[PDB]
Design an enzyme around this catalytic site. Structure first.
Site, PDB file in Angstrom:
ATOM      1  N   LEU A  17      14.320  18.636  12.067  1.00 13.49           N
ATOM      2  CA  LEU A  17      13.009  18.896  11.413  1.00 13.49           C
ATOM      3  C   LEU A  17      12.262  19.986  12.184  1.00 13.49           C
ATOM      4  O   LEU A  17      11.921  19.818  13.338  1.00 13.49           O
ATOM      5  CB  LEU A  17      12.186  17.605  11.417  1.00 13.49           C
ATOM      6  CG  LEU A  17      11.307  17.549  10.169  1.00 13.49           C
ATOM      7  CD1 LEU A  17      12.066  16.843   9.043  1.00 13.49           C
ATOM      8  CD2 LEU A  17      10.026  16.773  10.488  1.00 13.49           C
TER       9      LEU A  17
ATOM     10  N   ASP B 249       8.203  39.492  15.775  1.00 13.81           N
ATOM     11  CA  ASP B 249       7.877  38.040  15.666  1.00 13.81           C
ATOM     12  C   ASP B 249       8.610  37.451  14.459  1.00 13.81           C
ATOM     13  O   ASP B 249       9.166  36.372  14.531  1.00 13.81           O
ATOM     14  CB  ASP B 249       6.363  37.869  15.504  1.00 13.81           C
ATOM     15  CG  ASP B 249       6.016  36.402  15.236  1.00 13.81           C
ATOM     16  OD1 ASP B 249       6.514  35.543  15.954  1.00 13.81           O
ATOM     17  OD2 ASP B 249       5.265  36.163  14.306  1.00 13.81           O
ATOM     18  N   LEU B 250       8.621  38.147  13.349  1.00 20.41           N
ATOM     19  CA  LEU B 250       9.325  37.620  12.142  1.00 20.41           C
ATOM     20  C   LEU B 250      10.769  37.272  12.513  1.00 20.41           C
ATOM     21  O   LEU B 250      11.247  36.189  12.233  1.00 20.41           O
ATOM     22  CB  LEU B 250       9.325  38.684  11.042  1.00 20.41           C
ATOM     23  CG  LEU B 250       7.885  38.999  10.632  1.00 20.41           C
ATOM     24  CD1 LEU B 250       7.840  40.356   9.929  1.00 20.41           C
ATOM     25  CD2 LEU B 250       7.376  37.916   9.677  1.00 20.41           C
TER      26      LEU B 250
ATOM     27  N   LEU C   7      14.223  31.773   2.450  1.00 27.19           N
ATOM     28  CA  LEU C   7      14.958  32.591   3.458  1.00 27.19           C
ATOM     29  C   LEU C   7      16.466  32.506   3.187  1.00 27.19           C
ATOM     30  O   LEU C   7      16.938  31.537   2.627  1.00 27.19           O
ATOM     31  CB  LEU C   7      14.661  32.060   4.862  1.00 27.19           C
ATOM     32  CG  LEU C   7      13.213  32.384   5.233  1.00 27.19           C
ATOM     33  CD1 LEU C   7      12.644  31.255   6.095  1.00 27.19           C
ATOM     34  CD2 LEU C   7      13.168  33.701   6.016  1.00 27.19           C
TER      35      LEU C   7
ATOM     36  N   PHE D 141      10.931  34.140  14.185  1.00 27.29           N
ATOM     37  CA  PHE D 141      10.719  32.983  13.269  1.00 27.29           C
ATOM     38  C   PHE D 141      12.029  32.655  12.553  1.00 27.29           C
ATOM     39  O   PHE D 141      12.454  31.519  12.504  1.00 27.29           O
ATOM     40  CB  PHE D 141       9.648  33.343  12.234  1.00 27.29           C
ATOM     41  CG  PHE D 141       9.365  32.146  11.357  1.00 27.29           C
ATOM     42  CD1 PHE D 141       8.905  30.953  11.928  1.00 27.29           C
ATOM     43  CD2 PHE D 141       9.560  32.230   9.974  1.00 27.29           C
ATOM     44  CE1 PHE D 141       8.640  29.844  11.114  1.00 27.29           C
ATOM     45  CE2 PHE D 141       9.296  31.122   9.160  1.00 27.29           C
ATOM     46  CZ  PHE D 141       8.836  29.928   9.730  1.00 27.29           C
TER      47      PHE D 141
ATOM     48  N   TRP E 177      -2.106  40.046  12.642  1.00 25.15           N
ATOM     49  CA  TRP E 177      -1.377  41.125  13.367  1.00 25.15           C
ATOM     50  C   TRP E 177      -0.006  41.357  12.725  1.00 25.15           C
ATOM     51  O   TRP E 177       0.688  40.428  12.362  1.00 25.15           O
ATOM     52  CB  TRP E 177      -1.175  40.695  14.823  1.00 25.15           C
ATOM     53  CG  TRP E 177      -0.510  39.356  14.848  1.00 25.15           C
ATOM     54  CD1 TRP E 177       0.809  39.136  14.628  1.00 25.15           C
ATOM     55  CD2 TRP E 177      -1.107  38.051  15.091  1.00 25.15           C
ATOM     56  NE1 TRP E 177       1.056  37.778  14.712  1.00 25.15           N
ATOM     57  CE2 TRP E 177      -0.092  37.067  14.999  1.00 25.15           C
ATOM     58  CE3 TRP E 177      -2.418  37.629  15.379  1.00 25.15           C
ATOM     59  CZ2 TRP E 177      -0.368  35.712  15.184  1.00 25.15           C
ATOM     60  CZ3 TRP E 177      -2.699  36.264  15.566  1.00 25.15           C
ATOM     61  CH2 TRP E 177      -1.676  35.309  15.468  1.00 25.15           C
TER      62      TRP E 177
ATOM     63  N   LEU F  20       6.951  25.534  15.290  1.00 27.98           N
ATOM     64  CA  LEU F  20       7.322  26.959  15.522  1.00 27.98           C
ATOM     65  C   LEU F  20       6.237  27.873  14.944  1.00 27.98           C
ATOM     66  O   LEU F  20       6.230  28.167  13.767  1.00 27.98           O
ATOM     67  CB  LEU F  20       8.660  27.240  14.829  1.00 27.98           C
ATOM     68  CG  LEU F  20       8.993  28.734  14.901  1.00 27.98           C
ATOM     69  CD1 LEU F  20       9.125  29.164  16.361  1.00 27.98           C
ATOM     70  CD2 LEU F  20      10.313  28.990  14.175  1.00 27.98           C
TER      71      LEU F  20
ATOM     72  N   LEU G  17      -1.074  37.238   7.775  1.00 28.76           N
ATOM     73  CA  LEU G  17      -1.316  37.200   9.249  1.00 28.76           C
ATOM     74  C   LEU G  17      -2.299  38.318   9.615  1.00 28.76           C
ATOM     75  O   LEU G  17      -2.465  39.258   8.863  1.00 28.76           O
ATOM     76  CB  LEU G  17       0.006  37.432   9.989  1.00 28.76           C
ATOM     77  CG  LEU G  17       0.636  36.090  10.369  1.00 28.76           C
ATOM     78  CD1 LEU G  17       2.153  36.173  10.197  1.00 28.76           C
ATOM     79  CD2 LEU G  17       0.317  35.770  11.831  1.00 28.76           C
TER      80      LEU G  17
ATOM     81  N   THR H 134       4.433  31.698  20.177  1.00 30.45           N
ATOM     82  CA  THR H 134       4.516  33.120  20.625  1.00 30.45           C
ATOM     83  C   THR H 134       3.115  33.593  21.018  1.00 30.45           C
ATOM     84  O   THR H 134       2.237  33.711  20.186  1.00 30.45           O
ATOM     85  CB  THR H 134       5.034  34.003  19.481  1.00 30.45           C
ATOM     86  OG1 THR H 134       5.911  33.257  18.646  1.00 30.45           O
ATOM     87  CG2 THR H 134       5.782  35.202  20.064  1.00 30.45           C
TER      88      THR H 134
END
Ligand SMILES: NC(=O)C1=CN([C@@H]2O[C@H](COP(=O)(O)OP(=O)(O)OC[C@H]3O[C@@H](n4cnc5c(N)ncnc54)[C@H](OP(=O)(O)O)[C@@H]3O)[C@@H](O)[C@H]2O)C=CC1
Ligand SMILES: COc1cc(Cc2c[nH+]c(N)nc2N)cc(OC)c1OC
Length: 162
Positions: free
Chosen positions: A94, A26-27, A54, A30, A21, A4, A19, A116
């Protein structure tokens, strides 16, 4: 075992830790993509991440040390062990989260690929590894436009054929 990551038109991922950009959409992709799944991040990314670990998400760190202390987040030092947990978890497979070092050790053992592709083009020195797109097939793809020409991007999900 799934990959991913996010890359621009050329296929960049991250340069010097942070990163290249800034893509807020996008976050969320993720996190949403790793909700209730095992997130494999090498000691380089886990140390560069913004908010670790997270919320309501399984996160695993990869390092070659033996005193890695991370309470709250899983910790392993051998892809062999990580492969066991997913095989033992009936609700947590996984999932790879990078960085590039983790995409290489797991490149041979892949089951789902999530990339992405942004419309903008950024430069750097660290890019995603060479995946065998010809051996996989995208089963789902969603394109979303954004108020920013470069922040525009698409999500590509692949599955390995048998
Ligand atoms: N586009 C994307 O999805 C993502 C992009 N990125 C970008 O990529 C960068 C990281 O890429 P890269 O420089 O390759 O570094 P990584 O973040 O991929 O480094 C992974 C680290 O994990 C440890 N490790 C790797 N393989 C093993 C193994 N088999 N056993 C034990 N430990 C292992 C090593 O740490 P040690 O030093 O402890 O041995 C290694 O340095 C990030 O800083 C960011 O810019 C980061 C995450 C995701
Ligand atoms: C979820 O937050 C972050 C996530 C990542 C890794 C990452 C990002 N985006 C995607 N699509 N896959 C990933 N593995 C890298 C970061 O910084 C380099 C982050 O913080 C902004």
């Amino acid at each position: 075992t799934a990959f991913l990551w996010a890359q621009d038109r050329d296929g960049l991922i991250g340069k010097d830790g942070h990163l290249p950009w800034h893509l807020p959409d996008d976050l969320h992709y993720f996190r949403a993509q790793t909700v209730g799944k095992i997130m494999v991040v090498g000691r380089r990314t886990y140390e560069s991440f913004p908010k670790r670990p997270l919320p309501e998400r399984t996160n695993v760190v990869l390092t070659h040390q033996e005193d890695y202390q991370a309470q709250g987040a899983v910790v392993v030092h051998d892809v062999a062990a990580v492969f066991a947990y997913a095989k033992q978890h009936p609700d947590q497979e996984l999932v790879i989260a990078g960085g590039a070092q983790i995409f290489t050790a797991f490149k041979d053992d892949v089951d789902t690929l999530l990339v992405t592709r942004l419309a903008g083009s950024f430069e750097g020195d660290t890019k995603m590894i060479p995946l065998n797109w010809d051996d996989f097939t995208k089963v789902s793809s969603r394109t979303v436009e954004d108020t920013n020409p470069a922040l525009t991007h698409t999500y590509e999900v692949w599955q390995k054929k048998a």
